[PDB]
Amino acid sequence: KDIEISASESKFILEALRQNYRLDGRSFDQFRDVEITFGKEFGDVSVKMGNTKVHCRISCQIAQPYEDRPFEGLFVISTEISPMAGSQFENGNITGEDEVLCSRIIEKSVRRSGALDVEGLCIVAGSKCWAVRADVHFLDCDGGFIDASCIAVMAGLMHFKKPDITVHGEQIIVHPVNEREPVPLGILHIPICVTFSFFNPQDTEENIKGETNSEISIIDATLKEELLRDGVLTVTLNKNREVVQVSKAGGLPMDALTLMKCCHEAYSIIEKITDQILQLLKEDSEKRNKYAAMLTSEN
């Protein structure tokens, strides 16, 4: 399972960056357009950026909490790749490296960051809590998965609602779904990750001892773009201007002064897209309630 590209094609794109061109039609520092569409279920969404397609799912159920944090509920994200999304991939390799490179990000992007209040999953302390689940599916790759799965999970959390609960010791009263309403969830902050994609037009030494910074960085590598890149970097931020994570794990060497200059441009990008989610969550729920207005008057 190996992608084969000519070195002639390798120089071609490398030339295009040397004349400030890229094959998609975007700018270097331009991001794709995002299509968000929900299914009928809560925590159901289809997210699409041109060629890359994803789908995720949020659910929850009853379990006991750990001994470790006996206060808090349970939550984890599955991101199992299927070779459906591209023939590179093993059947569910949870031990591949790029998978881990997809994993630990979303592990830190959600779980260690804590966008979601796990303490608001405590139904009863130590007895019964929530087990909230996030199964990420990939559909078709043009890269940006780890940015797409960044979004589509956080999209899904802002669309899921959990049903109604009443406690009497052991008499724990899960109510019928349609009499007593499902209840949405508590998001502390909304993180958005950004892939950065790096291209030395030169050898090693002109990056190493060539003092002249000459390295091109772009956003959202397409599939062919992604196969030649030299370093890998993802930052994540919010609306309140705090930096969630940064991960440059090796690759090409890279100036620090670039990275701050990189990460500022992230901010203006992610903010506009964030609010686009925020209206569409409202507007769909508005469309839910206008169709709820088109239901009770109908019934």
Binding site: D117, V183, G186, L188, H189, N240, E242
Partner: protein
Amino acid sequence: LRRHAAPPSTNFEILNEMLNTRKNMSISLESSKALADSLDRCVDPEDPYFNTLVRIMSTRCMMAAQYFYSGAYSYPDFRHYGLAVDIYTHFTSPIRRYCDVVAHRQLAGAIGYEPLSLTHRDKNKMDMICRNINRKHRNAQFAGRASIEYYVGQVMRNNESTETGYVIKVFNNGIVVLVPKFGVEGLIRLDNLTEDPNSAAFDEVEYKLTFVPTNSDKPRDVYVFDKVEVQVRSVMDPITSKRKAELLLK
């Protein structure tokens, strides 16, 4: 935010017994509009203040509203019951309410002026705040009433008068009288309420301490919320050093 709950019938039935056995009235307690409209009808014509007399008296059993962070509880638990709004904070006085000043800060990101500070996002740090800032407001009006206290506590030091005091409790030990012009209570204990306490009879259902007096002997049916003559005074109790309102019936 700040939430206010319902004072239930349990805080109101013990008035309702005084409202029914004596005053032949009650409260609604269905909705606090209907309660506030069953409170609007509990006014006596010969005393238009008997409107207001219940208002100052039902005060003592109203639910203590308190500041909180909305992540503590859910949306109808954001209710202000006494002010009929499902959502309620304080905003408009920065100097006496540091609560309002913080609400500027989390508004400062809501208009995009500024990133929010972190401690204004930690519900651990918030619960430490929201109890304490209520506790400072608790530590305010306990002195705010006490501001009036010593400043009343010098008034009746040597300026006594015979006036109208209102019985707010009829007990077996005596009755507690209250001057509406002054707003300071005093138990006129039964023996200094009346001579011959073996002839004094305290009823629990009617809440009457019927007796023959100290200064007289006519069978005095000491009910509630009527009008009396009473001598005011004050002498500081030498075992407590509180300037007690020396209140003595007349």
